[PDB]
Amino acid sequence: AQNPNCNIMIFHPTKEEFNDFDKYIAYMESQGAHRAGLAKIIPPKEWKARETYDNISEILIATPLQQVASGRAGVFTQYHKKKKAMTVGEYRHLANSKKYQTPPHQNFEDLERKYWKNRIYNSPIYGADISGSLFDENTKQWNLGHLGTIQDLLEKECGVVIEGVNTPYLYFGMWKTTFAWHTEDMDLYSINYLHLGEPKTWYVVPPEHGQRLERLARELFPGSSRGCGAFLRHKVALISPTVLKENGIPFNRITQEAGEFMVTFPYGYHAGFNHGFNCAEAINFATPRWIDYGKMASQCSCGEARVTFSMDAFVRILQPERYDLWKRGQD
Ligand SMILES: O=C(O)CNC(=O)C(=O)O
Ligand SMILES: [Mg+2]
Ligand code: NI
Ligand SMILES: [Zn+2]
Secondary structure, three states: OOOOOOOOEEEOOOOOOOOOHHHHHHHHHHOOHHHHOEEEEOOOOOOOOOOOOOOOOOOEEOOOEEEEEEEEOOEEEEEEEEOOOEEHHHHHHHHOOOOOOOOOOOOHHHHHHHHHHHHHHOOOEEEEEEEOOOOOOOOOOOOOOOOOOHHHHHHHHHOOOOOOOOOOEEEEEOOOOEEEEEOOHHHOEEEEEEEEEOOEEEEEEOHHHHHHHHHHHHHHOHHHHHHOOOHHHHOOEEEOHHHHHHOOOOOEEEEEOOOOEEEEOOOOEEEEEEOOOEEEEEEEEOOOOHHHHHHHOOOOOOOOOOOOOOHHHHHHHHOHHHHHHHHHHHO
16 A cells, blocks of 8 residues: 555645646555545646736725634634635735734744734734636646536546536635634535745544544534534634644645645645745645545534535535435525
């Protein structure tokens, strides 16, 4: 069995190996990369996402989100307070202001320590979930707006034709902006490219151990757990590495830098934070190996998780027994 300790693997494809996206994912899995839940892909030196980032300041962040925490430093939830619209140039200036800027630090480890000590005492503002792309249309390799769609994968594997679309999303971050513990919708893959700026630190639980994380989360968030049998789908709970280690939960960590891709694999729980002003692009995708995970994915039916249009068909076809309850949660 390849990668039996479930370590995060780092890949360096050549320019030739960068041509066929599906083939390279399958190669990484042949080497056991999925067992970690997360892999890093460093593009060949010949590749570029676009020519420059000099002209992005006029993108609008229609609904910036202020991430307000509650709890203790290692075990907290966050809620998202909506703020007035602002441009990427305005958001960059805000990220760099004395109130929000990254503190002085020695190295990534010192900054990680400072994050976990102090996150709860601040409320950073995240420009998340913005439909759009920063890949040049002429970039033919690993262009996250030109991937094979999940609807086409389902149709190729299962024969059923379904409605829905699959487009990328931009994330503009600042120091301490936080992504809570989650798997993807329908336990899909994700791919994330860090276009510019400061790093993103990731934490991940191997898919084979995801239920250990779920059981801890039920213990640590007991009111939330009573409210919903899949409350991690709400994407609000944080648990620190120190608390994970105290409770014996297997996990790994890695820091993504500008120019690097990360892939999350089906049912790989992940969480993390941004080091300073940055911009990432991400999208969900599927492969043949996903189908069995989609069929078994948990679902939130309490009303909180509310998701895209395109998840309807995935539930309807892969999980017909759950469909009626889940759709009530949507309505
Ligand atoms: O970058 C973020 O805020 C969150 N991203 C993801 O969870 C992802 O790419 O799967
Ligand atoms: Mg612009
Ligand atoms: Ni994710
Ligand atoms: Zn719920």
